[PDB]
C-alpha cells in the first residue's frame, strides 16, 4: 500500500502525522535550563513515537526494527524540528513559543553554546534554501528510516524502497514548484547533504548529554505498543 | 577555475587527483597487541594524511578558498575521507578491511583494540552497501570530494558568504557530474534521482562512523591540529 502511494499521497499522510508545537514552563545556569530542555524533549518524545507509526512503511517493519530506527534517530528528529521552527527567528532557537533562546544564552550551560551554534547555522541554511513544510516532512522521514537502516535483508529492501518513494516525492514537489531537472537534482542533493550536518549535531549532542549525566531500547519498546 | 569544467572534465581531474595506495610498515612483530596495531594504523593514517592535502588542493574549487577555510574543511573532513578511502578499497574483500595491500584485517583482528570492533563492523557494513550498489570509481571520487566541501561548510561577513556560496556552486557542479555519469551509463531520470539520493544518505553514516572514530581515538588518548594542517597546506 505505502509502496503504491503518489507524491501527493505521501505528502498528505506526512503533513497529517505532524506532532503539535509544545510549550516550556519558564535567570538560568546549569540545572534549570537543562531542566526545561530535558522536560520539553521528553514530552516531544511521546508525540514522536505516534508520528513515526504514521510514516508510510514504518509500521510494516518489526517492533525490534521500529525501536532501533527510533533509538538512533530521536535526537536528529528533535533537532530538525527545532531548526525548522527557528527558520523565521534569525539568530535564535524556538524551543517552544514561550522559550525563544539567544546564541548568547547557550553560555548558561557548558558545552551547549557549540550545539546552539551548529543549530542556528542549520536554521539559516533552511531559510536561504526557502525549505517548504512539505520538504521538511519528507526529510524528517528520511532521517527516521535512514539513521539505523545499516545494522533482516527483506526489512532493508523495504526501507530502501520507502526511501526511493520519498526521493520521488521530493522530486515531484520541486517539479510542481516549477524547477528544471538540473535544479531538481541539485536541490535534492542540497537537502540530503544537510542531513550529514544534522547527523553530526546529533552525535555531538549525545556526547554533550553524557557530560551532563539517553533512552534505552526497553524505553521505546513499551511506548510503540 | 572549477565552474568552467564539463562533467567529463570534472571527473577527469578527480580521477587524476587520487592519492596512491600506501603500505603499512613491512614485517612488524606478528601478531599485534593493541598498542602496536594502533601504532601501525596511526603511522599509516599520518602518511595517508600528507597525500590527502596534495589531493585536496587538486579538488576543483578548494584552492579558490582561503587557507583558514581550506584547513577548516580538512579539520572537519579528514577522518570521513580516510574512512571512505578504506571502505572503497575494502569493497572486493567481503568481511575484510584492506587498510593497506599488506594490512588486510577481518572483524576478529578488530577485537584486538578495545572499542575498535564496533567501528570496524560499521566500516564493514558500509563497504558491503557500496558492493551491493556497485559503486563506480567515477562516483566514488565525486562522493570523496563532496565530503571535503560539505562537512565543514555549515560551521563557517561578505567574505565567507562568497566562500559558502562558491562551495555550494562547486557542490552543485559535483551533483551535475554525478547525474551525467548515471545518465551516461543509461539509468532513467527516476533511477538517476533514486541513486543520487542513496549515495548521499550513505554520507550521513560516514559522518556517524567519523564521529564514533574521533570519540574512540580520544578514549584511547593524537589527531591532526589546525596549525599542523596549515603547515602541510603551504
Ligand atoms: C539543544 C538540543 C536540542 C533540543 C533540546 N531540547 C529540545 C526540545 C525540543 C526540540 C529540540 C530540543 C536539548 C536537549 C535534548 F535534546 C535532550 C535532553 N535530554 C533528555 C532526552 N531524554 C530522554 C531520556 C529520559 F530518561 C534525556 C536534554 C536537552 F537539553 N538539546 C541538547 C543536546 F541534547 F543536544 C545536548 O546538548
Ligand atoms: C579508519 C581508520 C582508523 C580507525 C579505525 C577505527 C577507529 C578509529 O577511530 C580509527 C585507523 C586510524 C588510526 C589512527 C588515526 I590518527 C586515524 C585512523 O587507521 C586507519 C588507517 C588508514 C585509513 O585509511 C583509515 C584508518
From Swiss-Prot, chain A:
Mutagenesis or variant effect for residue 85 to H: In ESTRR; highly decreased estrogen receptor activity
Residues with lipidation of kind S-palmitoyl cysteine: 138
Processing after translation: Phosphorylated by cyclin A/CDK2 and CK1. Phosphorylation probably enhances transcriptional activity. Self-association induces phosphorylation. Phosphorylated by LMTK3 in vitro. Glycosylated; contains N-acetylglucosamine, probably O-linked.
Compartments, record wording: Nucleus; Golgi apparatus; Cell membrane
Impact upon substituting residue 138 to A: Loss of hormone binding capacity and temperature-sensitive loss in DNA-binding
Remaining remarks: Selective estrogen receptor modulators (SERMs), such as tamoxifen, raloxifene, toremifene, lasofoxifene, clomifene, femarelle and ormeloxifene, have tissue selective agonistic and antagonistic effects on the estrogen receptor (ER). They interfere with the ER association with coactivators or corepressors, mainly involving the AF-2 domain.
Similarity comment text for this entry: Belongs to the nuclear hormone receptor family. NR3 subfamily.
Disease: Estrogen resistance: A disorder characterized by partial or complete resistance to estrogens, in the presence of elevated estrogen serum levels. Clinical features include absence of the pubertal growth spurt, delayed bone maturation, unfused epiphyses, reduced bone mineral density, osteoporosis, continued growth into adulthood and very tall adult stature. Glucose intolerance, hyperinsulinemia and lipid abnormalities may also be present.
Protein name in the entry: Estrogen receptor
Source organism per UniProt: Homo sapiens
Amino acid at each position: 500500500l505505502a509502496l503504491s502511494l503518489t507524491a501527493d499521497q505521501m505528502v498528505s499522510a506526512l503533513l497529517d502525522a505532524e506532532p503539535p508545537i509544545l510549550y516550556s514552563e519558564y535567570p538560568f545556569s546549569e540545572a534549570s535550563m537543562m531542566g526545561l530542555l530535558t522536560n520539553l524533549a521528553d514530552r516531544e518524545l511521546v508525540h514522536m513515537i505516534n508520528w513515526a507509526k504514521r510514516v508510510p512503511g514504518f509500521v510494516d517493519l518489526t517492533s525490534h526494527d521500529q525501536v532501533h530506527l527510533l533509538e538512533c534517530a530521536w535526537l536528529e528528529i528533535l533537532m530538525i524540528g527545532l531548526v525548522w521552527r527557528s527558520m523565521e527567528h534569525p539568530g535564535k532557537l524556538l524551543f517552544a513559543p514561550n522559550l525563544l533562546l539567544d546564541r548568547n544564552q547557550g553560555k548558561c550551560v557548558e558545552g551547549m553554546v557549540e550545539i546552539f551554534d551548529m543549530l542556528l547555522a542549520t536554521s539559516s541554511r533552511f531559510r536561504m534554501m526557502n525549505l517548504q513544510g512539505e520538504e521538511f516532512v519528507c526529510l524528517k522521514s528520511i532521517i527516521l528510516l535512514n539513521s539505523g537502516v545499516y545494522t533482516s535483508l527483506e526489512e532493508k529492501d523495504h526501507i530502501h524502497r520507502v526511501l526511493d518513494k520519498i526521493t520521488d516525492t521530493l522530486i515531484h514537489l520541486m517539479a510542481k514548484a516549477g524547477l528544471t531537472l538540473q535544479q531538481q537534482h541539485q536541490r535534492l542533493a542540497q537537502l540530503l547533504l544537510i542531513l550529514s550536518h544534522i547527523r553530526h549535531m546529533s552525535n555531538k549532542g549525545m556526547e554533550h548529554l553524557y557530560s551532563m549525566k539517553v533512552p534505552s531500547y526497553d524505553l521505546l519498546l513499551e511506548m510503540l505498543d
